[PDB]
């Protein structure tokens, strides 16, 4: 009970970060040259590493599972701004 | 001189992925680790230092093969800590 209100907590800082890096990378530029799919295919990658915390289980298993997602969207969404930030710079 | 560094780097490289692909291929379907695990992250991984294209010069050269390695060692990390949970259970 407790365990999903903080799930929910987690969730959704992931999504506040998954809006940040959509808009980080729609911001049309093409001198920045960003790949179509470039997001899905980063997204997908977080994803499924995340779901290796399935063989964890239990509570802390689910609770790992979200931490890490949140952590690589967070180095991504870094990770895109400091391109930019190389690119302008360049 | 910038040359010598990045040849130590991509040497870096070939190790990285080298003890990344043994530690997944460390076979216990415990670990649940996907067929095509190891590629589609690395692959992950290309296309992000690939953008470094876009920097050009030498100092776009560097970065992409800089951070192709943090990339890397943070891969081999994650799924050493991993391997760590599971284990732990």
């Given at each position: 009970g407790v365990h999903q209100k903080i799930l929910v907590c987690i969730q959704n800082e992931i999504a506040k970060s998954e809006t940040q890096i959509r808009n980080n990378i729609s911001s049309?530029?093409?001198?920045?040259?960003?790949?179509?799919?470039f997001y899905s295919k980063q997204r997908l990658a977080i994803h499924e590493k995340c779901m290796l915390y399935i063989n964890v289980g239990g509570q802390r298993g689910e609770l790992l599972m979200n931490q890490c997602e949140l952590s690589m969207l967070q180095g991504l969404d870094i990770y895109i701004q400091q391109y930019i930030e190389d690119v302008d710079n360049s």
């Open positions: 049309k530029s093409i001198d920045y040259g960003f790949p179509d799919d």
